[PDB]
Each structure stands twice: as structure tokens, then as C-alpha cells.
Amino acid sequence: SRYFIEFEELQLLGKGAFGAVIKVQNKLDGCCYAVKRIPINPASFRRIKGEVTLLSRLHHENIVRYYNAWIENVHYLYIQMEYCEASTLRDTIDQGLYRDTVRLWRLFREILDGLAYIHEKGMIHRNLKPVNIFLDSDDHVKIGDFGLATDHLAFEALYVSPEYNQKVDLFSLGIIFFEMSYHPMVTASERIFVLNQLRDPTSPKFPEDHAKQKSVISWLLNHDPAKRPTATELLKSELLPP
């Protein structure tokens, strides 16, 4: 009702393991929003209501803007967010991010910004990857899609680390940063093999074809989490623009 009464749908934006995200217009503002709708078994889910509570409270220029969350009668939970016009980092990676080194670095920064904020509120994303990082109409990172059935209090295989510790997201960032700083990997066999190589237990292994990027991703991907830098610690490293 509230969904259908007050919104019109425009485009399936994505489909999750749980339920979908629909780009919609609001009747009254006329504003486009993204809306996760999840089918829900009231009493089980208590996790979810938890992560809703937990995620509502996040405010950052590098998080997707929250708007509202409600339920409609037995079934569904809706979550209304900012609709980022430039889609995902994935799209941006696949259309030649490695080319623009200036842009590459800036975005990487914004992500770190986000992770720091998340980390200092005592929180972890865990489901971090380029499909889960969006881009506003001003081409700024908006991190999102935390995972509502996933605990985010600091107490799909390629982005996960070999291990609750903030170090997990910074591993993922190395995988991500690599892809940002690399040519689009046309083949699936390519994507998969190349990244399996970044995840070499003793030491990462890279393509044959960008020198500052190496040292960073090496730091980030360190198999021992204690030799990976904090979002701020790495924001402090001299290995950085602007």
C-alpha cells in the first residue's frame, strides 16, 4: 500500500539473495529513490531490525543517504535510500578507470573516508566490493548494501579475506583498488585467476603489465591482518595525492 500508494517503479536496479532493489519516483517530491524490498518472517529477522537500527544512524558523504524503512501486512520490509545516478564502481571499473589515474586515486580516497567513519562508529561492512559501492551525479563514492542479515558490530569469495575485525574491509579494498587501477578483465576466467593470484598466502602475485598502486595493494592484502593499515593510517601514508 504505502509503497504502491506513494511511489511509482521505473527500473529493477538489482536482485539480491533475499529480495530486489527498485529505482522509484516519489509522488510528492517527484524524487527518484532506490528501494530494497525484503520478504520477512516476523520473529526469527530480529538480526535485520537490529542492522536497520544500526545503519539508520550512519551519516557520511561516502555512505548512501538513508530516508525511511517500514513493513506492510505478514510479508515485506522496505528501505528507501538515495538513488546514485552514476550506478556502481563495477560499471566505472569496466569502462576504463585504470586510464584516469587522477580520478582513480580520488575515488579510492573517498572509499577510505567511508571505511574510517564506519570503523570509528565501531562497525564493519564485510560485504564490500565494486557492485556494493555506488556513484552520485557528482561522481562521489556512496558505500552501501551492508547486508541486513549480516552482523556489522566490530565485536562472492574473491573480496573475502583468509580469516569480526575492521582489517577485513581493507583486504577487500586491495582487491577493489587493484580492479580500479587495472584494465577491465573481459573474460570471467581472467577476473577469477588474476585475483586468486593476489591472494597468495606467503605474498601476492600481480600481472606482467602503476608502481605506487603495487606497494599500497601489497600492504592492504597482507595475509596477517595486523600488517594491514587502518583506513586513517593509510589516509596518512605519503603514497597518496592529491
Q: Interface with ligand KA4 by CB under 6 A: which residues?
A: 13, 21, 34-36, 52, 55-56, 58, 63-64, 66, 69, 79, 81, 83-84, 87, 134, 144-146, 148
For the chain, the first-to-last Cα distance in angstroms comes to 49
Contact 223, 174 (CB under 8 A): no
* Nearer Cβ to ligand KA4 (149/192): 149
The owner of cell 578483465 is 185
Residue 141 beta carbon to ligand KA4: minimum distance, rounded to whole angstroms: 12
CA distance 82 to 92: 19
* Nearer Cβ to ligand KA4 (79/104): 79
Residue 123 beta carbon to ligand KA4: minimum distance, rounded to whole angstroms: 11
Evaluated on CA atoms 34, 39, 43, 45, the torsion sign reads negative
* Nearer Cβ to ligand KA4 (32/195): 32
* Nearer Cβ to ligand KA4 (66/76): 66
Query: H/E element holding 68?
Result: strand 66-71
Residue 94 beta carbon to ligand KA4: minimum distance, rounded to whole angstroms: 15
Residue 66 beta carbon to ligand KA4: minimum distance, rounded to whole angstroms: 3
CA distance 111 to 177: 10
